[PDB]
Structures are given as C-alpha cells and as structure tokens.
C-alpha cells in the first residue's frame, strides 16, 4: 500500500497527490525544508529570513528507483529529515539536504517496487522542517 514512514511522524500530517506529471518537489539546504508535488503545494517551513531552503529540480517519480533518507538531531534544533538521496533507474542520484549539520543520525533505505506508481506523498511537518514522509500506491 505504501513505503514506510521515513523519519518521524509526531508533527502535522499533510497529504499531496501526485499529478500526471509524476513530480516530487523539495526545498532544501542544510536539511529538508519542504516537500510537495507541484511548485505551489509544498509542505514545510516558510521562506523567511535566512530560512526555507532553495527550491530544487523536481524528482521524476516514475524514474525513481530508491531513496536513502538520513534523519537526526539537526544542529539548529530538533529531529528532522536532513538529507534524501534519490537514486534513479539509470543509476544516477541526487542528494538533497546534508548529513553534516546533524548528530544522532539514522539512515533508512527503500526501493520502489517495479511498476508501482506513487499516487500520493504524505509529509509530516511542524511548520519549520520536514520530520517525515511516505510514498503511497
Ligand atoms: C546549503 C543551502 O542550499 N543553503 C541555502 C540556505 O539554507 C539555509 C536555510 O534556508 C534552510 O532552511 C536550512 C535547512 O535546510 O539550511 C540553511 O540554514 O538558504 C539560502 C537562502 O535562504 C540559500 O541561498 C542557501 O543556498
């Protein structure tokens, strides 16, 4: 029915439906600031002051093979998802976020089953960073 919940799920859950474009959008910097499925519906912290991260190139979810999600105690506070490495079906990968500004880190690895379309992304945020996310089929 879906992937595990990566990271943590204690904060507020928002749900984002994957459109026909099959795209996942993120804002990231030293951690993961926001996740969405369009440029307009990202869930996470606001862009204010020096916070919010940068909007990255979208992840093509139909070309996605696996994720490597790093979570830990972020240096500026709290447990969140701080880095995600997306590995595509061609063997290339993109690393968003960082593993260098957090301690007490854990790594969760998950491979999208062949021929299963991700229809929805659940995201847990407390209004600053992304604490967790989940793929749903
Ligand atoms: C590494 C990076 O891309 N830094 C960008 C920086 O990110 C800040 C902050 O905005 C983020 O919320 C946190 C957590 O990811 O990390 C850093 O502290 O934001 C700048 C603009 O706000 C960008 O110019 C930096 O590239």
Author numbering: 821 to 957
Show passages lifted from the paper.
RbmC2 was crystallized in the presence of N-acetylglucosaminyl-β-1,2-mannose (GlcNAc-Man), and the structure solved to 1.8 Å resolution. Density for the GlcNAc-Man ligand was observed in the same binding pocket identified in the RbmC2/mannotriose and VCC β-prism/methyl-α-mannose complexes. Alternate configurations for the two ligands were built into the density and their relative occupancies were refined, yielding a ratio of 65% GlcNAc-Man to 35% glycerol (presumably from the cryoprotectant). The mannose moiety occupies the same location as the α1,6-linked mannose in the mannotriose structure, making a similar constellation of hydrogen-bonding interactions. Coordination of the disaccharide by RbmC2 resulted in a total of 338 Å2 of buried surface area with a contribution of 160 Å2 by the mannose moiety and 179 Å2 by the N-acetylglucosamine. The N-acetylglucosamine moiety of the GlcNAc-Man structure was observed projecting away from the mannotriose binding cleft. Fewer hydrogen-bonding contacts are made between RbmC2 and this sugar, perhaps contributing to the higher B-factors and less well-defined electron density for this group. In fact, only a single hydrogen bond was observed with the GlcNAc group: between the acetyl O7 atom and the guanidinium group of R876. The only other observed contact between RbmC2 and the GlcNAc moiety is a van der Waals contact between the sugar ring and the side-chain of V874. Interestingly, the centrally located water molecule observed in the mannotriose structure was also present, even though the fourth coordination site (previously made by the central mannose moiety) is missing in this structure.
